[PDB]
Design a protein around this nucleic acid. Structure first.
Lengths: 81, 96, 25, 58, 150, 97, 216, 87, 206, 129
RNA sequence: AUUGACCCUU
RNA sequence: AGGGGAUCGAAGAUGAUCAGAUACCGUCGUAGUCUUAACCAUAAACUAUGCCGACUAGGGAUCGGGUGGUGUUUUUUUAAUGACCCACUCGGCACCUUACGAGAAAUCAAAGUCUUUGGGUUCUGGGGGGAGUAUGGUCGCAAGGCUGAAACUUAAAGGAAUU
RNA sequence: GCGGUAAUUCCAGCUCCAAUAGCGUAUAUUAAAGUUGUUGCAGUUAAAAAGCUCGUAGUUGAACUUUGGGCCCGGUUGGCCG
């Protein structure tokens, strides 16, 4: 189109665009509080966590790193921050 | 783009590049090397005296036909042999 | 004459010149 | 009919034929049939029409 | 980009706009600082310090939670390495490649890649020597590099 | 000038492709440039079908087939009419007949 | 006896359109040279050259003649025509018709101080045809037309008095040179200028206003 | 433009595209002059009274003719819910 | 600018929905078409019948703005739209070109079929590329019945409608004829003059 | 890599204006870019432009009109005096009555007209018409 | 399956 | 220079064909073809298209990564995973369409944004031959590689298209 | 390019044309030459992108630091005014 509002694009279009190609670039990742059954241990875990994050309580590897987002364990509950 | 540097301090590069490339010019190379004074038969001069030696009936190129004579000449200042053409009709009788 | 064969002929001429020069010097 | 030839009788028979019709009509309605997306499009338009909303799976 | 390859990849961190962030962080700047110090004493480069901080703890960026960056913390607290971590890792990679090549003389690809890695090392060393975080007359040598690493 | 945008072969991003030998003349030709055609044929020439079937030991025998891939140099393909010279506009037709 | 077959031609014959300026304004495509010579009766037509072109046949070469003619009024209007025919007379006449049909307006301007009538072009322009690029530069008064005899005549027919030219490519191709110069003078009204920045009320086309008195 | 004493010169001030504000050439034969009728409170359009748009052959060739006309019509108020500024 | 009676009536919405004009092209989509909304699964897109509607009314406004009824021309080379444009040309002036559009009908002033239109309404730009390409030579504005995959080049007033659906093509042409007659005022059918005209068969294409 | 940010911005503006768009996006929005756009604005060649603040370098969205024929950058920024003002403005301007050579003088960034009015010269940045 | 050549200018 | 040495096979042998045929065709066959060590440094080494950066049309397909869809196969027709199917996204090898444009054209999404001529930078060319020759230098065991003229000669060579 | 038996080109006669106390020729050089290209060339196929990558000198190199608001005064204009 010849005429369009680049200063005020649609939310759907900006969500569709690459993270660095938006107007003001922002991270598509997020932080989440993961609690494991048993020990409450509300602990903030990065969505792309590159590590076997474990709380100090016991054998509680929370997330296993993947190519992109960190995959969480089987018994675990996460809340987006 | 465009090859050549566009820096404000690239003038040495530009001048050297022009100097290097000017040698591709036929007249510039000849003038700078002095091929006239060193290997031109006349030695860079417009005219030259010489002495007539013999009879050379040069045959014309194509499509043409004219074969009488052209003077072989020894230059006075050089001693070099040179063929010269007699420039008119029947003027071969004056250049014996 | 094919350019490759002219190149080969010029190489032969070059090496013959080299041999004759080395003989004379 | 023969293509390329057309006369007054041919034009008249064309109009008579396309105005005449067999009387049988067996296409009576069963009421219309729209999907979720079409139904919400009509809602966005804000009209009041009778429709049956069935999602066509991928 | 990719000074030593033909790759044209754009892939990096989309740093958030906000500097006074992130409105869910109830820990303290001093707590993050002493976490920096504990990890550095444990023997971790600022890269992995920041990784584990962002990754196991809630640390959006140590720069925005504290007043300065991890290398600045380490240098202020005496934990800065003798040589910078990027140059150290380049030297480690060069030592590994050279060790491989000594056995595999026939690895012309390894020879080419060693040339590239050592060129990167020399360029980084020149920059560091200019900004003076490395002393003058510091020079990378293949003979002494393995001992320099550890 | 450039007769074809593909240079008469199929190589973009390779540099080198191992050669094959033409099945008619045994000329070395890069594999991407060849005129390979897959020939799948019945054994019994489709004329001895009834004779072989009625002379077979087993009823309703499956009648296996023979498979081969014939690689062709450009000269041999054109001579053997595997491919023909086409007009300039429809050289660009990639679709097989 | 004209008897046009065109909405525009019938309008021009009827006299509803009086100036070629309406045609140029509304971009009406002219197709009858009677329109052009009725709206600009004072244009002078004159040929740039005639050349022979040969097409080879199984029996010798069939030779036609291609004529380049330039039509130009006293002030602001020229057209260029190129036509090939069996005979030179036919080539000349048909080239005259084509040149009249292809008449374009010229934006003549001032080098500076806008004292008298516009003597030069408004801006530097450029046309290309083949390798020939012809660039026209405004020149101060009294300078004349600094141009090769080919495009100089075209500029004289345009009505410019002072102009510089700069040619590039093989300019001995008279056809390409004249076409490039024609493109150059044509672009002068396509170049937008601050004195042209003003918006306009967008009037109605002559065909639309007089659609009732046309053939329809 | 004019000369020193006014006296409008430079014959044929030209039209410009309503969408790109660029001059329509004398032989720009891909350009158009769209006329839209206005309706006066009765479902019937006023004869001899229209809103006009000059649309460039460049726009038409590029294919943005329809989007540009939608935007201009909505800007003029004779279209309601077609063209969206924030694509 | 409208007197607020031209908005989509529920009966016309039912007509368009039943004719399936909203069932636009497949997951192939020209970017010059923002008429899509809420792309259905299976890949079929739903054409926003609202903007279809006011684009149709705008095209009718242009057609009414044109003074002479017989300079406007309506073109259909597709088999579905031939009788639709014939009935359009019988209902208003709108001279028809059905079947074959001989090249040089807009240029080539010596041609027998030489027309000099002030508007062409094309059933399908892809099938009628010749008429559009000739209009681009003579300065003729173009209205066109365009799907979501149609070549929006050289067309000024699009009408987003199902050009694959014969019912949709016929319905859009009828709606164009009805709206131009209503705007011209010859069709005084506002609410309840002579009224019942769902009476007969719209559906006889062959 | 990225040598002249102003050249990138002006080339983007040229491309958008030629393709007919009424707006253009510019990254990464230098101060020289802002001053150049302000000069073009006060001469009415672009219209409005808005600076987007991403904390890295900034962006510009320029609303264009049809009035811009060609804006360009002269690289390198040649040192130009009063005497060479005429040489430039004659070499690269379509006419003597409109269009401006823009240049950094010690009195800020201006066109050749304002540089002549204030009796200042400097380094040539670019031109607009 | 073999098939080489055909003076100069015009 | 060692090893290896099946096949094919510059040279060579030999049978045809032929006016001739130390060519094509046929059968052999040394070097070579493989490898180790050391040299060589050339190819139509090509995309005949230097590298880095920005922008400018539409479209589908494909390869690698990622993201979102209780969308399909079995554990479990009752979370997972996998493989597929959709929608994007980043990066590749490419392709189809068109001409905003460019070009001498063939054609080119770059060969565009270049007489409205300037984003940074490296290399190369200046009519055709003589000639990649001579000479000097340097590298190589050599073959040769890199650098590299001139005298003299010549009005065309050449590119892309048309009948 | 002209001339091989009908030469508007040779050798002449007549006529004509250009410059003209000057005119012609040779060589050199300048414009033409955007055929040296800083302005301002070209490099897919016409001559020309090094086989490819590294790399020193050289050339070039992202953005950012004081920006914006209030009162008067030498000096110019179709000057409010003949």
């Amino acid at each position: 189109v010849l005429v369009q509002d680049l200063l005020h694009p649609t939310a759907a279009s900006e969500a569709r665009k690459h993270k660095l190609k938006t107007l003001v670039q922002g991270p598509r990742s997020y932080f989440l509080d993961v609690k494991c059954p048993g020990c409450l241990n509300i602990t903030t875990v990065f969505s792309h966590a590159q590590t076997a994050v474990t709380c100090e309580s016991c054998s509680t590897i929370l997330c296993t790193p993947t190519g992109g987002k960190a995959k969480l364990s089987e018994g675990t509950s996460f809340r987006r921050k | 783009g465009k090859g050549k540097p566009r820096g404000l301090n690239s003038a040495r590069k530009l001048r050297v590049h022009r100097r290097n490339n000017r040698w591709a010019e036929n007249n510039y190379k000849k003038r700078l090397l002095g091929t006239a004074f060193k290997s031109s038969p006349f030695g860079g001069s417009s005219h030259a005296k010489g002495i007539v030696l013999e009879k050379l009936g040069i045959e014309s190129k194509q499509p043409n036909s004219a074969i009488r004579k052209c003077v072989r000449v020894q230059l006075i200042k050089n001693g070099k042999k040179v063929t010269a053409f007699v420039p008119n009709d029947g003027c071969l009788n004056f250049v014996d | 004459m094919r350019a490759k064969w002219r190149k080969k002929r010029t190489r032969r001429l070059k090496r013959k010149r080299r041999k004759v020069r080395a003989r004379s010097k | 009919p023969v293509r390329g030839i057309s006369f007054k009788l041919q034009e008249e028979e064309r109009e008579r034929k396309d105005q005449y019709v067999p009387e049988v009509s067996a296409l009576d309605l069963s009421r219309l049939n729209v999907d979720n997306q079409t139904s919400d499009l009509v809602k966005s338009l804000g009209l009041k029409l009778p429709l049956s909303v069935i999602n066509v799976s991928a | 980009g990719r000074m030593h390859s033909a790759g044209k990849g754009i892939s990096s961190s989309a740093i958030p706009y906000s500097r006074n962030a992130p409105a869910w962080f109830k820990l303290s700047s001093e707590s993050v600082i002493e976490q920096i110090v504990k990890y550095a004493r444990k023997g971790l480069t600022p890269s992995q310090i920041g990784v584990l901080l962002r990754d196991a703890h809630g640390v959006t960026q140590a720069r925005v939670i504290t007043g300065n960056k991890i290398m600045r913390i380490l240098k202020s607290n005496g934990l800065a390495p003798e040589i910078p971590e990027d140059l150290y890792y380049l030297i480690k990679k060069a030592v590994s490649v050279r060790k491989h090549l000594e056995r595999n003389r026939k690895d012309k690809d390894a020879k080419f890649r060693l040339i590239l890695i050592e060129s990167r090392i020399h360029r980084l060393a020149r920059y560091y020597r200019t900004v003076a975080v490395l002393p003058p007359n510091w020079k990378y040598e293949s003979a002494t590099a393995s001992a320099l690493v550890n | 000038p450039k007769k074809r945008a593909s240079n008469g072969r199929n190589k973009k991003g390779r540099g080198h492709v191992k050669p094959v030998r033409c099945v008619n003349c045994s000329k070395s030709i890069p594999k991407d440039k060849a005129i390979k055609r897959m020939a799948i044929r019945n054994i019994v020439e489709a004329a001895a079908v009834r004779d072989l079937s009625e002379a077979s030991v087993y009823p309703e025998y499956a009648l296996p087939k023979t498979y081969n891939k014939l690689h062709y140099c450009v000269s041999c393909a054109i001579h053997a009419r595997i491919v023909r010279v086409r007009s300039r506009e429809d050289r660009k037709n990639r679709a097989p007949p | 006896g004209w008897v046009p077959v065109t909405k525009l031609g019938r309008l021009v014959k009827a006299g509803k359109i009086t100036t070629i300026e309406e045609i140029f304004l509304h971009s009406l495509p002219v197709k009858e040279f009677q329109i052009i010579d009725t709206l600009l009766p004072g244009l002078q037509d004159e040929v740039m050259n005639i050349k022979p072109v040969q097409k080879q046949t199984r029996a010798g070469q069939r030779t036609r003649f291609k004529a380049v003619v330039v039509v130009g009024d006293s002030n602001g209007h020229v057209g260029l025509g190129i036509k090939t025919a069996k005979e030179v007379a036919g080539a000349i006449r048909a080239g005259i018709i084509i040149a009249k049909l292809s008449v374009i307006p010229i934006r003549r301007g001032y080098w500076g101080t806008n004292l008298g009538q516009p003597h030069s072009l408004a801006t530097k322009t450029t046309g290309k045809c083949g390798s020939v690029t012809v660039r026209l530069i405004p020149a101060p008064r009294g300078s004349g037309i600094v141009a090769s005899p080919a495009v100089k005549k075209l500029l004289q027919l345009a009505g410019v008095e002072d102009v510089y030219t700069q040619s590039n490519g093989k300019t001995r191709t008279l056809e390409n040179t004249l076409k490039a110069a024609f493109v150059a003078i044509g672009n002068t009204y396509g170049f937008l200028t601050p004195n042209l920045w003003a918006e306009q009320p967008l009037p109605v086309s002559p065909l639309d206003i007089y659609s009732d008195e046309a053939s329809a | 433009m004019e000369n020193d004493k006014g006296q409008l010169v430079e014959l044929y001030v030209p039209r410009k595209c309503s969408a790109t504000n660029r001059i329509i050439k004398a032989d720009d034969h891909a350009s158009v002059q769209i006329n839209v009728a206005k309706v006066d409170e009765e479902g019937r359009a006023i004869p001899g009274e229209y809103v006009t748009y000059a649309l460039s052959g460049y726009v038409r060739s590029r294919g943005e003719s329809d989007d540009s006309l939608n935007r201009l019509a909505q800007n003029d108020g004779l279209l309601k819910n077609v063209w969206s500024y924030s694509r | 600018s409208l007197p607020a009676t031209f908005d989509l009536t529920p009966e016309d919405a039912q007509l368009l929905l039943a004719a399936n004009t909203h069932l636009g092209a497949r997951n192939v989509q020209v970017h010059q078409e923002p008429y899509v909304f809420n792309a259905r699964p299976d890949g079929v897109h739903v054409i926003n019948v609202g903007k279809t509607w006011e684009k149709l009314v705008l095209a009718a406004r242009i057609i009414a703005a044109i003074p002479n009824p017989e300079d406007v021309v309506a073109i259909s080379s597709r088999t579905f739209g031939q009788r639709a444009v014939l009935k359009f040309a019988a209902h208003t002036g709108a001279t028809p070109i059905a079947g074959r559009f001989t090249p040089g009908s807009f240029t080539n002033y010596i041609t027998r079929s030489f027309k000099e239109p002030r508007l062409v309404i094309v059933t399908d730009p892809r099938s009628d590329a010749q008429a559009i390409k000739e209009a681009s030579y003579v300065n003729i504005p173009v209205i066109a019945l365009t799907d979501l995959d149609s070549p929006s080049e050289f067309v000024d007033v699009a009408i987003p409608c199902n050009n694959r659906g014969k019912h949709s093509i016929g319905l859009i042409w009828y709606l164009l004829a009805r709206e131009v007659l209503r705007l011209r005022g010859a069709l005084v059918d506002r609410t309840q003059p002579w009224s019942i005209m769902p009476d007969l068969y719209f559906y006889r294409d062959p | 890599t990225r040598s002249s940010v102003l050249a990138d911005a002006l080339n983007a503006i040229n491309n958008a204006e030629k393709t007919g768009k009424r707006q253009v996006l510019i990254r990464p929005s230098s101060k020289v870019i802002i001053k150049f756009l302000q000069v073009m604005q006060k001469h009415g060649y672009i219209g409005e432009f808005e600076y987007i603040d991403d904390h890295r370098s900034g962006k510009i969205v320029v609303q264009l009109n049809g009035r811009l024929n060609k804006c360009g950058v002269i690289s390198p920024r040649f040192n130009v005096k009063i005497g060479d003002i005429e040489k430039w403005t004659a070499n690269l301007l379509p006419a003597r009555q409109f269009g401006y050579v823009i240049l950094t003088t010690s009195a800020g960034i201006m066109d050749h007209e304002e540089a002549r009015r204030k009796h200042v010269s400097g380094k040539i940045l670019g031109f607009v018409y």
